[PDB]
């Protein structure tokens, strides 16, 4: 498999097919699926790293949508990449305005 | 002779809303573009139309921002735009967190 | 005893910002979806996941809208959200003309 | 009917960053939807890149310059690091 030859867990073969049948260009050169599969594997690793930490902080071992929302909205760059994206059953960050707190 | 504070401003609003010329001077804006671009990559050149496209887009962005900024100032029962009006506008339209 | 006005209001904010469940009743929302869809095409059916997808997007849209609405009220030295705050948020967002 | 997803692949990634953690079906679809969206966003930028330059091929270079346009600075820097590493390793083997 091309995934093992690239050292990746994501399917290099499946990515190459989706680039062909996606009507992105007349021809898809080699390495482009392994490059994209590695970028997709890295980004999933980045979210699962921060979401798994959110699960351990929330005293749970299984990552729920709440743990994915906490991981993305607390990271400056994942929030900017997913700015126009809605994560279902994720809720919002705890944020109370200072002028609304009592004295 | 002296005009009261506000009559010349409203006169300028009508003057520049009827016209379409660029309001930033060409050479200062061009040096700013080259300076910012130089920090990204050295040894860069620009087509004369590429800079004009940047000034046409930057000025149109700021004017549209000054409109939403003016609405935030008027929303707070004010006539003067303040930095907090700009930041609130940039936050609502999604440019800020 | 009796809590002062605004005490349990902040308690509700901390309660609902901590949870992720839906806040609109599903059946009244489902009847609202089928009513609006009836005006575009008659004799339509909806998947269970299709109605829940609309409710997840509708609540997340409104919650984000109240966040912008709340900021407009604070910008006007107020703590109560008013229709003029929603209209300003949607105007700056580009939704309302 | 045979439906495909990235479920088995995000597990192998999850076990490398957190071996003693799990993931629910709700969060699994969210991860599955996240991969497809980023896949389309990157491949779409790479498509326009080839069209803008009158070229017919989407190689690893179009994928790289598409990552630098789509991902934020610090995320894009490490993504190119992961991308360039896998390509040179795929060529050696």
């Amino acid at each position: 498999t091309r995934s093992s030859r690239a050292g990746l867990q994501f399917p290099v073969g499946r990515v190459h097919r989706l680039l062909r049948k996606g009507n992105y260009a007349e021809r898809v050169g080699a390495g482009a699926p392994v490059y994209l599969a590695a970028v997709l594997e890295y980004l999933t690793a980045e979210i699962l790293e921060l979401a798994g930490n959110a699960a351990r902080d929330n005293k749970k071992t299984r990552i729920i949508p709440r743990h994915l929302q906490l991981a993305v909205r607390n990271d400056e760059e994942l929030n900017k990449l997913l700015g126009r994206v809605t994560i279902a059953q994720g809720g919002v960050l705890p944020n109370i305005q200072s002028v609304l707190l009592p004295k | 002779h002296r005009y009261r504070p506000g009559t010349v401003a409203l006169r300028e609003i009508r003057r520049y809303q009827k016209s379409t010329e660029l309001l930033i001077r060409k050479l200062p804006f061009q040096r700013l573009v080259r300076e910012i671009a130089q920090d990204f990559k050295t040894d860069l050149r620009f087509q004369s139309s590429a800079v004009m496209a940047l000034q046409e887009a930057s000025e149109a962005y700021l004017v549209a921002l000054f409109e939403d900024t003016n609405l935030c100032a008027i929303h707070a029962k004010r006539v003067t735009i303040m930095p907090k009006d700009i930041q609130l506008a940039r936050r609502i339209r999604g440019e800020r967190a | 005893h009796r809590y002062r006005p605004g005490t349990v209001a902040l308690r509700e904010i901390r309660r609902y910002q901590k949870s992720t469940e839906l806040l609109i009743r599903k059946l009244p929302f489902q009847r609202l979806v089928r009513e609006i869809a009836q005006d575009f095409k008659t004799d339509l059916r909806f998947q269970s996941s299709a109605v829940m997808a609309l409710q997840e997007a509708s609540e997340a849209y409104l919650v984000a809208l109240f966040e912008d609405t709340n900021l407009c009220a604070i910008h006007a030295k107020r703590v109560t959200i008013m229709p003029k705050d929603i209209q300003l948020a949607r105007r700056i967002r580009g939704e309302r003309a | 009917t045979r439906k495909e997803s990235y479920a088995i692949y995000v597990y192998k990634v999850l076990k490398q960053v957190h071996p003693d953690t799990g993931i629910s079906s709700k969060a699994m679809s969210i991860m599955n939807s996240f991969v497809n969206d980023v896949f389309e966003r990157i491949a779409g930028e790479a498509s326009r890149l080839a069209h803008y330059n009158k070229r017919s091929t989407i190689t690893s270079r179009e994928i790289q310059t598409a990552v630098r346009l789509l991902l934020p600075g610090e995320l894009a820097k490490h993504a190119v690091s992961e991308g360039t590493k896998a390509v040179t390793k795929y060529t050696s083997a």
């Binding site: 050292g7 594997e41 890295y42 690793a45 980045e46 790293e49 921060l50 607390n74 990271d75 400056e76 760059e77 929030n79 900017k80 944020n95 305005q97 200072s98 002028v99 | 930041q87 609130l88 936050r91 800020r96 967190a97 | 900021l71 604070i74 | 490398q16 960053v17 610090e74 995320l75 490490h78 690091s81 992961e82 590493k85």
Partner: peptide, 16 residues
């Protein structure tokens, strides 16, 4: 694993 993960997760500063 071999993932070159960024060591810092900065919080986005929001309005107010």
């Amino acid at each position: 694993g071999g993932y070159n993960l960024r060591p810092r997760t900065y919080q986005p500063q929001r309005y107010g």
